[PDB]
Design a protein around this nucleic acid. Structure first.
Ligand SMILES: [Mg+2]
Ligand SMILES: [Mg+2]
Ligand SMILES: [Mg+2]
Lengths: 51, 52, 175, 187, 112, 129
RNA sequence: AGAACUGGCGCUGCGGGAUGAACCGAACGCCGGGUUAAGGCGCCCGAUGCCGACGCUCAUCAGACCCCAGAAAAGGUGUU
RNA sequence: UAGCCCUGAAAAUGGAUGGCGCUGGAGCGUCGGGCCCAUACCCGGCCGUCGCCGGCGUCGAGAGUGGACGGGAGCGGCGGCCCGGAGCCCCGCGGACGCUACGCCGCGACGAGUAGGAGGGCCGCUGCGGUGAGCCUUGAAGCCUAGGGCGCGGGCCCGG
């Protein structure tokens, strides 16, 4: 019994939606990382362009 | 009563066709109701001093 | 109740099951201090069953939320009321402390009644914790901290042993 | 290791026969192949009649056999008994049934053949019907023994019906007190 | 309740257990579940042929909750890696033996 | 060493110390052969900590390595020329011992035959001149 | 000394209670890694060598952890 | 009034929070985060026992979770100058192991024990009917050995 949740393609042998459950949420926490570097820099370099 | 009584209902849904659950169950855990505090506020109490 | 760790102030409201004899029971309310939300909804049904004909298999609660302070950084004078058991009898007691929130005072009461009167945290019943303002405090131990332009030094300072040279050639000085 | 009830984990039934019979082993080795290979249950009944004991293989007399095969629906089936066939002198007329059994006695297998039957053995039954298709398996009276009439509650309890052990049936042997009301008690 | 400890498990602590520590009884033995085939040959007569269809019926208490829960071998969990608290008295009394009312999700992770 | 068998596994033996009898050291009326203690008081049967261990079936060695010699073979003692030839289909797995009751003249042919059949004799150099 | 309900020693080791029949944990094939239970963590003795938290406490008879191993009434402008 | 402390508080070998010792605690109370280890629990190994089994298909020609067919009629796709039909291989004559069936393999769960009850013994000693074209004065039995091993054990084999 190779462990599910710790290697891939054993989750997927038992749950095929679990891969597209994974690359639907790595996208919304890599695009939300870009949304917290761009918006962060747009308020870290914002007042740094004031004074 | 619950065996003979059902007999008025096993050949009643026979001609009408359900899955009526004449078998019984224990008490289910209670359903999520939606309690009401119309007007007032919950009355505040607190335990009383020790006097003999 | 163990009062393990810091305490926490819960509000619990609660009523009893809808009867044929009476609809809409009044849904009473308390203010429980407990280290998590399970002990709050287990001492709630302790203080209720001493005061009404409600017991936990004949009544349900609808709300157990952490109620917490409106000024966590404003120093306050707390004055509370106890009902602790002693060995010989049980006793009504007033008591004051000085901390930044009510859960910082009732924690300091169980640590105080444990120190001075050997009461374990199961035999003790809070009646009501509210602040009073300054210059209404009865306790003279708290009362001396109510003076602006206060100054006192730090005499005889010692800590952090074995941290340095468990074996050194430099005598420590109190300072 | 939770369960103190470990005393029943070993099932007690036979796995091999305790005999040293080199012809009975070649009938188990036939049928324990046929037990696990054929998708039937007749081959898993006649297999388990293979082990066990000589007490549990009672002699099936010939007149129970021709009584339990005159019934409706037993017109052309073979008689099966793991166990011996003796004859009855009690019965006169014998129909021409087809039988199959270990060890038919000699005064029985000539009162069978003269009526027009045929005795079979369990090698020419497997080549006849592997599935057991279209046969009747029979059984003798295993609780007809003189042993199974000493067995009951106890011979001195109320009712009892147990036949207590005596070395010589007659007067003055277990008929004095407890066995009649005039002396002692009526059990 | 002096001998047990229970609460209300959430979804991933009903998900952690079936995958990592689930084991199915086939007739009488406990074998690693590992393949959707080993549920469908046993219990597709009720309608849950795959792995995550078992976990609907065991998380939402379903129509076939008896036939799903009696299918599973009991969870041979491990000793916790945070210690425990006094083990004998109630969880209300500062122990941990009784009803703990969804705090069980903090405990199941240490048990596994 | 040259005769070089088939696979030789990792021979692990669970215990290398040879079970001795309780009160073996203290007398010579009790030899070291094992006899299990069946007293009422004694603490080897009752099995306290730090005392004489006693055999049970958990010390049973591996089913693929039981009776293996550390050379890699399994011994099989022979007596003459003919019953050395029963071993010709096991020349890579089983080895021949020669019994002590063999003389030194008949130990000369069955050590030369065991090279034409390529069979390891454990003692090829025994009771020679 | 004698009974009732359950458990245990008797038949049973193992970690703990300094040692111990019954107490608290836990019941045993032979072992490698992991984690805990009752317990503990100055030195014997594996582990507080944490910059632990808040107090109480001076004993010219201190106190120190279930059963469990030496105590009460009454009294103290000791002290909280 | 109640916590700590003291008076109340006397027994015989020299003595007992276990000892040493301990007083910004190595004492008492209420608590936090760590940390140490049982034969407990988890993972894995190995052995045994129990349970449910598997192969006489050694059938490189056996394939079975449907096959022969066959005349009465068209589907596509194969041998075109719109007709469409057996290959019993043979360029290789080639293909490991195995099933003491009282044996071999698989999977799974359990493993304490006095009294007492049964199973196995290729444990051992003495004697007989068999049987090893068995063993030996080119040294059998017996005893000894800081010699080499095997079996968990009863015991055994070999060297000197
Ligand atoms: Mg005894
Ligand atoms: Mg003794
Ligand atoms: Mg015995």
């Amino acid at each position: 019994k190779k462990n599910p949740l710790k290697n891939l393609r054993i989750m997927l042998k038992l749950n095929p939606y679990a891969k597209t459950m994974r690359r639907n949420t790595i996208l919304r926490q890599a695009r939300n990382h870009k949304l917290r570097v761009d918006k962060a820099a747009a308020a870290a370099a914002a007042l740094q362009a004031k004074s | 009563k619950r065996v003979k009584e059902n007999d008025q209902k096993k050949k009643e849904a026979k001609e009408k066709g359900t899955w009526v659950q004449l078998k019984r169950q224990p008490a289910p855990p209670r359903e999520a109701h939606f309690v009401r505090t119309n007007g007032k506020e919950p009355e505040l109490l607190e335990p009383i001093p020790y006097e003999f | 109740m163990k009062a393990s760790g810091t305490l926490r102030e819960y509000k619990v409201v609660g009523r009893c099951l809808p009867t044929p004899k009476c609809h809409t029971p009044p849904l009473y309310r308390m203010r429980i201090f407990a280290p998590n939300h399970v002990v709050a909804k287990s001492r709630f049904w302790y203080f209720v069953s001493q005061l009404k004909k409600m017991k936990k298999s004949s009544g349900e609660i609808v709300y157990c939320g952490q109620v917490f302070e409106k000024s966590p950084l404003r120093v306050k004078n707390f004055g509370i009321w106890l009902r602790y058991d002693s060995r010989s009898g049980t006793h009504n007691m007033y008591r004051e402390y000085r901390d930044l929130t009510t859960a910082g005072a009732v924690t300091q009461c169980y640590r105080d009644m444990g120190a001075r009167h050997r009461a374990r945290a199961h035999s003790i019943q809070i009646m009501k914790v509210e602040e009073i303002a300054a210059s209404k405090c009865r306790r003279p131990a708290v009362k001396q901290f109510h003076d602006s332009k206060i100054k006192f030094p730090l005499p005889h300072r010692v800590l952090r042993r074995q941290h340095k040279p468990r074996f050194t050639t430099k005598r420590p000085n109190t300072f | 290791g939770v369960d103190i009830r470990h005393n029943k984990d070993r099932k007690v039934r036979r796995k091999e026969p305790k005999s040293q019979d080199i012809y009975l082993r070649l009938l188990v080795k036939l049928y324990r192949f046929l037990a696990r290979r054929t998708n039937s249950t007749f081959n898993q009944v006649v297999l388990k009649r293979l082990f066990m004991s000589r007490t549990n293989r009672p002699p099936l007399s010939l007149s129970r056999m021709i009584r339990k095969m005159k019934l409706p629906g037993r017109e052309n089936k073979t008689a099966v008994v793991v166990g011996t066939i003796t004859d009855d002198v009690r019965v006169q007329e014998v129909p021409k049934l087809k039988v199959c059994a270990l060890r038919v006695t000699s005064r029985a297998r000539s009162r069978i053949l003269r009526a027009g039957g045929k005795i079979l053995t369990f090698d020419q039954l497997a080549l006849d019907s592997p599935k057991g298709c279209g046969t009747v398996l029979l059984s003798g009276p295993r609780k007809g023994r003189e042993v199974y009439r000493h067995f009951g509650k106890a011979p001195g309890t109320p009712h009892s019906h147990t036949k207590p052990y005596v070395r010589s049936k007659g007067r003055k042997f277990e008929r004095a007190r407890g066995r009649r009301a005039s002396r002692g008690y009526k059990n | 309740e002096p001998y047990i400890a229970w609460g209300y498990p959430n979804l991933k602590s009903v998900n952690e257990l079936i995958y990592k520590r689930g084991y199915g009884k086939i007739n009488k033995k406990r074998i690693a579940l590992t393949d959707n085939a080993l549920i469908a040959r046993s219990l597709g007569k009720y309608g849950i042929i795959c792995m995550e269809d078992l976990i609907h019926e065991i998380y939402t208490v379903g129509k076939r909750f008896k036939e799903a829960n009696n299918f599973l071998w009991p969870f041979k969990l491990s000793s916790p890696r945070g210690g425990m608290k006094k083990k004998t008295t109630h969880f209300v009394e500062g122990g941990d033996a009784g009803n703990r009312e969804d705090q069980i999700n903090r405990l199941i992770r240490r048990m596994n | 060493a040259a005769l070089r068998p088939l696979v030789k596994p990792k021979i692990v033996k669970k215990r290398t110390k040879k079970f001795i009898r309780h009160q073996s050291d203290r007398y010579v009326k009790i030899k070291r052969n094992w006899r299990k203690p069946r007293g009422i008081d004694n603490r080897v049967r009752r099995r306290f900590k730090g005392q004489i261990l006693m055999p049970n079936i958990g010390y049973g060695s591996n089913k693929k390595t039981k009776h293996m010699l550390p050379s890699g073979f399994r011994k099989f003692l022979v007596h003459n020329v003919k019953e050395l030839e029963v071993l010709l289909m096991c020349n890579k797995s089983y080895c021949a011992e020669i019994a002590h009751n063999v003389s030194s003249k008949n130990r000369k042919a069955i050590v030369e035959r065991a090279a034409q059949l390529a069979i390891r004799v454990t003692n090829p150099n025994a009771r020679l001149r």
